[PDB]
RNA sequence: AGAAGCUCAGACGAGUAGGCAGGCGUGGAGGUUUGUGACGAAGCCUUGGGCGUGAGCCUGGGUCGAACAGCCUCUAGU
RNA sequence: CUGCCGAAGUUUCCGGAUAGCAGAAACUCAGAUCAGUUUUAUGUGUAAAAUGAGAGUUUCUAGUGGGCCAUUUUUGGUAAGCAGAACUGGCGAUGCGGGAUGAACCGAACGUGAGGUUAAGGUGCCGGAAUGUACGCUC
RNA sequence: UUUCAAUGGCCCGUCUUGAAACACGGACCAAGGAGUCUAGCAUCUAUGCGAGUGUUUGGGUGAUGAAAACCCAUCCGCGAAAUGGUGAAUGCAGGUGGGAACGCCCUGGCGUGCACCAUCGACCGU
RNA sequence: GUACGUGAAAUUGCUGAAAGGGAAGCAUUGGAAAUCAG
């Protein structure tokens, strides 16, 4: 897919920004991000705030200051009660997830803000959502 | 719309007992947020009351861990493991007729 | 680059580009200038002029 | 660079010569036994993308400019920066008064007019 | 600035030395074979020249009415079109291939002039799966620098003498797209070459045919 | 640098069933063009000219006498 | 209206599900595997060098399920025809040069043009091209 | 544009068949004339929100057209729990291997390892 | 000019130009005549 069927002007702007980053760098991260932006909504499942909190402090944990990146929506998980500190960059945040992360935790980021902070994807965890649906 | 239909381009080609279930992990979510800030995590003599019947639930199931804060659960029915976890968390179950 | 293809055989300049040795080739050499030794075995002649 | 057209004759619909009800506007024959779709000898030719003309000279008149439709003096002003690329063509429903005004403004601006001597 | 000019100048002299060495090798090999034959004739002995490890194959029959068994072999020989010429490593595994596509291709032993003229005029390299003409030595150098082939003369040598990297050189050369012969074929062309036709093995007459096609 | 874009290189081109993409034209609607028009709109005619591979488009002249179109979207008794 | 991709032409089980051919989506794979191919080796089959090509799978969704002609083997043959299989071809989706004319014959497979050269077949004239060359046969 | 010369050119559609031919249709021209609307289901794509989601049965309201737009009380639909009454992290909501991506090194090594797939594992499908 | 806005095609008459020895329409390349364009 050379272009997305989405007519969102801001999604087209992200695609333009990561078209340059993919071709003018040598980051397999930026190439991955560009491909996932092209993917349809069916192939971009939402990832929960709890799974993000799990995958950061999972096994040896060692989350440190690594920023979680998902090309999709970060839906909140109301079952988990005490929210850890997290730094996630995503296409969209549900109003609950954005409010919960900000109140007790770190910061939320957009994909353009991440490209400024970590243009090469350094110290970034690229997380997908479960496609079992 | 008729214009975008592909037949515009074929022109020329010859053509029981009502009982909704709630699990333990969502019991605290049913309560509003300002009450959770007041009662959850604080050892207060008065405990919050979660009448899960008024929230459109018939039975409380046992999935999930409750926080150690005690809470009074008023319901019609409750799974045997659910109220085991409830007193393990310090709460009590009042069956509602 | 290379808008047109020029045949090295018909282009002395392109031949110089491709092969930096054509400038010194010495195609024709006179090697049959000594006593030409007629080398043919007599038995070979008999077999050749046989039957 | 000069303008050369791969073809000059128009493509006529088959048997448009024979029948007055069959217009000369091209229609692709869907007949299975159509010898003309089969490209037999003596039959007329069909429109193909191979007949497309040079990209750098497409849409260009013999003089080397592209006709641009103009209705008023405002339209001509839009052709100020392309007088060596576009030639103004006044619309057929423009009155005689606006004809002479358009021609004068284009002539002052240096923009060619394709049908100046009209109305 | 000066470093690249000096390196390229030294590379140019190195190619000249290699081409001079190759030219002497061809002259010596031809002369020594003549001396061996002359001495055999003088002694009455018979001298057998070595088998030709190189063969040049031209497809002479089109893409119509050809059995699937024969078609696959020309697919493996990259003879996908009529009047297409390629170099083949003549060995026991190729003799059987060419014997079963005898009615559809002709082949023979190409001399140095045939190989030299083919690569000069019809020489096209397969660079990034594209037909790029061998218009300068740097094209060959970047595509065959691993095998120590730096110029057209090196490529001609690797093809003519069938060196260790003959497979890589032959695969690098896009199949030569030869024209219809100047003067035409024989009266009947699809008869076997022996029987008066123009098909099958023809030994040293592949040269006389190729000069027509160039 | 209409990145939707610009540029370089190579190869390929029949094509039924089928699959896929981009375009042309028509009636009406929202927006727009400081849009055209009784000094002639629309229509029509013409061995007048131009553009497009093509569906088609623009124009000269004649006739005519009151309305009409380009672009962006909507819609269909297209 | 133009452009691109492009079959099946029939198995295998009960009108069909299946497979096959054609596409799409999503995966992994380039120190890898494939192949209407040939060699080598072991006894026609099995196994491992040549040459060519990037090679794999999973999902799901269209169309196809006929025939004709010919070769070879073979089964009987029979007044003589032929009849029965298999075999891969050619047609079928396909114009073009030649065979005076042509569904099955010889060449050749197709964007629009310029130039050059050929295939099959031809060079007395119709007809583009030697009433050429050499040797015989024939009334 | 008309006309002449040389060369070429079998009537279109439909139907049947392996294929033709047949068999119908066609005097001429203009205008009309055939996959439409709707209910359900399913795929894919886009959009909004996301453990939620859905204002338009209805009520409020709307002075400029008020059949529009705007606002939303209580229910309800689907989803959030399955199994045949009961009703789910044992184990970082479990280990091994492959793996996207990242990091540290001096091609390769080490660490981390999403999705998905084989694996031992559980809990009443999670 | 009530056989009444605009007046298409089929069809018909007249005039001009041209063609025609048992079809015709069409296509290609030019000539001739006419007429345009730059």
Angle in degrees, 0-180, between the axes of helices A95-103 and A49-56, rounded to the nearest 10: 40
* SS3 annotation, A81-113: CCCCCCEEEEEEECHHHHHHHHHCCCEEECHHH
Cβ of residue D46 near strand G, that is under 7 Å?
yes
- Against chain A, the chains showing at least 3 CB pairs within 8 Å are B
Structural domain spans, chain E: 1-214
Nearest to E78 by CA among E177, E210, E209: E177
Min Cα distance C19 → chain E (Å) is 7
Determine contact, residues E213/E182, Cβ cutoff 8 Å. Answer: yes
Q: Return the closest nucleotide (C1') to the Cα of A15.
A: F3
Determine contact, residues E132/E140, Cβ cutoff 8 Å. Answer: no
C-beta neighbour count of D18 within 10 angstroms: 8
Distance CA A88, CA E120 (A): 61
Q: Which residues of B touch A78 (CB under 8 A)?
A: 26, 29
Cβ of residue D39 near strand G, that is under 7 Å?
yes
Cβ of residue D117 near strand I, that is under 7 Å?
no
Distance E98 CA to G42 C1' (A): 27
Resolution in A for the shown PDB structure? 3.2
The residues that bridge with E57 in the sheet, in sequence order, are E86, E107
Q: Which residues of E touch C8 (CB under 8 A)?
A: 120-121
Label residue C36 exposed, middle or buried (CB < 10 Å: 0-12, 13-18, 19+).
Answer: exposed
Residue with tokens 């709890």: A50
Do the chains contact at D27 and B12, CB–CB below 8 Å? yes
Min Cα distance A27 → chain B (Å) is 41
- The secondary structure element, H or E, covering residue A67 is strand A67-75
Structural domain spans, chain A: 1-133
Question: For strand A124-126 and strand E105-108, is the pairing parallel, antiparallel, or unpaired?
Answer: unpaired
- Against chain B, the chains showing at least 3 CB pairs within 8 Å are A, D
Cβ of residue D20 near strand I, that is under 7 Å?
yes
- Tally of CA atoms within 13 A in the half-sphere of D36 that contains its CB: 16
Structural domain spans, chain D: 1-118
Cα angle at A107 between A103 and A109, to 5 degrees? 135
Radius of gyration of chain D (CA): 20
Distance CA B21, CA B58 (A): 6
Do the chains contact at A79 and B29, CB–CB below 8 Å? yes
Question: For strand D66-70 and strand B92-95, is the pairing parallel, antiparallel, or unpaired?
Answer: unpaired
Distance B23 CA to H120 C1' (A): 30
Min Cα distance B10 → chain D (Å) is 12
Determine contact, residues B28/B48, Cβ cutoff 8 Å. Answer: no
Distance CA C10, CA B13 (A): 56
Distance CA E73, CA E68 (A): 9
For residue E192, the 8-state DSSP code is: B
**Going by C-beta distance under 8 Å and a sequence separation of 6 or more, which residues neighbour residue A48?**
A74, A75, A76, A77
C-beta neighbour count of A64 within 10 angstroms: 7
Coil, helix or strand at residue D114: coil
Q: Which residues of C touch E13 (CB under 8 A)?
A: 20
C-beta neighbour count of E110 within 10 angstroms: 24
DSSP of C1-51: ---S---TTT-HHHHHHH-TTTTS---------S-------HHHHHHHT--
Strand G bases with any atom < 7 A from protein Cβ = 1-4, 25-27, 35-40, 49-54, 88-90, 94-97, 106-113, 116-122
Distance CA E43, CA E41 (A): 5
């Amino acid at each position: 897919r050379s272009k997305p069927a989405s007519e969102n002007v801001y999604l087209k702007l992200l695609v333009k920004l990561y078209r340059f980053l993919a071709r003018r760098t040598d980051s397999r991260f930026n190439k991955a991000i560009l491909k996932r932006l092209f993917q349809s909504k069916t192939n971009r499942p939402p990832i929960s705030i709890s799974k993000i909190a799990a995958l950061t402090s999972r096994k040896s944990a060692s989350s440190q200051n690594k920023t979680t990146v998902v090309v999709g929506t970060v839906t909140d998980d109301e079952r988990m009660l005490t929210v850890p500190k997290l730094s996630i960059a995503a296409l969209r945040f549900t109003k609950s997830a954005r409010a919960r992360i900000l109140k007790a935790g770190g910061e939320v980021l957009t994909l353009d803000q991440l490209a400024l902070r970590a243009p090469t994807g350094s110290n970034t965890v690229l997380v997908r959502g479960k496609k079992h649906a | 719309p008729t214009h975008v239909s592909k037949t515009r381009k074929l022109r020329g080609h010859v053509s029981p007992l009502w009982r909704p279930t709630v699990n333990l992990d969502r019991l605290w979510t049913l309560l509003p947020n300002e009450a959770r800030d007041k009662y959850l995590g604080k050892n207060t003599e008065v405990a919050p009351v979660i009448n899960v019947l008024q929230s459109g639930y018939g039975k409380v199931l046992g999935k999930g861990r409750l926080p150690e804060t005690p809470v009074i659960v008023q319901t019609r029915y409750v799974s045997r493991r659910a109220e085991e976890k409830i007193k393990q968390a310090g709460g009590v179950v009042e069956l509602i007729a | 680059a290379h808008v047109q293809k020029k045949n090295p055989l018909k282009n002395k300049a392109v031949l110089s580009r491709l092969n930096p040795y054509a400038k010194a080739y010495k195609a024709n050499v006179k090697i049959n200038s000594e006593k030409t030794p007629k080398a043919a075995g007599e038995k070979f002649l008999s077999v050749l002029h046989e039957n | 660079v000069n303008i050369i057209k791969k073809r000059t004759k128009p493509f006529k619909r088959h048997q448009s010569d024979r029948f007055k009800r069959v217009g000369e506007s091209w229609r692709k024959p869907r007949g299975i036994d159509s010898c003309v779709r089969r490209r037999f000898r003596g039959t007329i030719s069909m429109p193909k993308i191979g007949y497309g003309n040079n990209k750098k000279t497409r849409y260009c008149m013999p003089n080397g400019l592209k006709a641009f439709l103009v209705r008023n003096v405002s339209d001509v002003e839009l052709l100020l920066m392309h007088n060596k690329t576009y030639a103004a063509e006044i619309a057929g429903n423009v009155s005689a008064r606006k004809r002479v005004e358009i021609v004068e403004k284009a002539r002052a601006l240096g923009v060619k007019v394709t049908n100046a001597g009209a109305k | 600035a000066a470093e690249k000019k000096s390196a390229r100048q030294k590379k140019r002299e190195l190619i000249a030395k290699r081409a001079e060495a190759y030219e002497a090798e061809y002259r010596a090999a031809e002369r020594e074979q003549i001396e061996l034959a002359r001495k055999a004739r003088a002694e009455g002995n018979y001298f057998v020249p070595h088998e030709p490890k190189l063969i040049f194959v031209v497809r002479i029959r089109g893409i119509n009415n050809i059995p699937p068994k024969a078609r696959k072999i020309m697919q493996l020989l990259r003879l996908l079109q009529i009047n297409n010429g390629i170099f083949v490593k003549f060995n026991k595994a190729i003799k059987e291939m060419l014997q079963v596509v005898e009615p559809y291709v002709t082949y023979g032993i190409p001399n140095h002039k045939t190989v030299r003229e083919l690569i000069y005029k019809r020489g096209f390299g397969k660079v990034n799966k594209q037909r790029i003409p061998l218009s300068d030595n740097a094209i060959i150098e970047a595509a065959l620098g691993k095998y120590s082939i730096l110029s057209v003369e090196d490529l001609i040598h690797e093809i003519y003498t069938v060196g260790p990297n003959f497979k890589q050189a032959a695969n690098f050369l896009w199949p030569f797209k030869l024209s219809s012969p100047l003067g035409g074929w024989r009266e009947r062309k699809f008869k076997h070459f022996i029987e008066g036709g123009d098909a099958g093995k023809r030994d040293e007459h592949i040269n006389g045919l190729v000069q027509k096609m160039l």
